[PDB]
Amino acid sequence: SWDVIKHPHVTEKAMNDMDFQNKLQFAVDDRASKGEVADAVEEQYDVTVEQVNTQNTMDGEKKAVVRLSEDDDAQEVASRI
């Protein structure tokens, strides 16, 4: 049984989407849909996900750019891990 969230995709461009657009970027299982990526992210870090964009990377993994509601703060969710 596979998991949806593999790990945080931390990189410079990943940091920006975080400090500037309240977005968290993850490496998720490539069989996962935006919707499944949303839930997981919510249930895991306890936040409200507004939108989720995906992309199938040249690394054979699926990267998801998750945007949190104004109630939640990316920088903060990220800092705890």
Partner: peptide, 12 residues
């Protein structure tokens, strides 16, 4: 998508 996973792998 499969073609991609392969191209990906080949790259690594």
């Amino acid at each position: 998508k499969a073609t991609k996973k392969r191209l990906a792998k080949l790259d690594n």
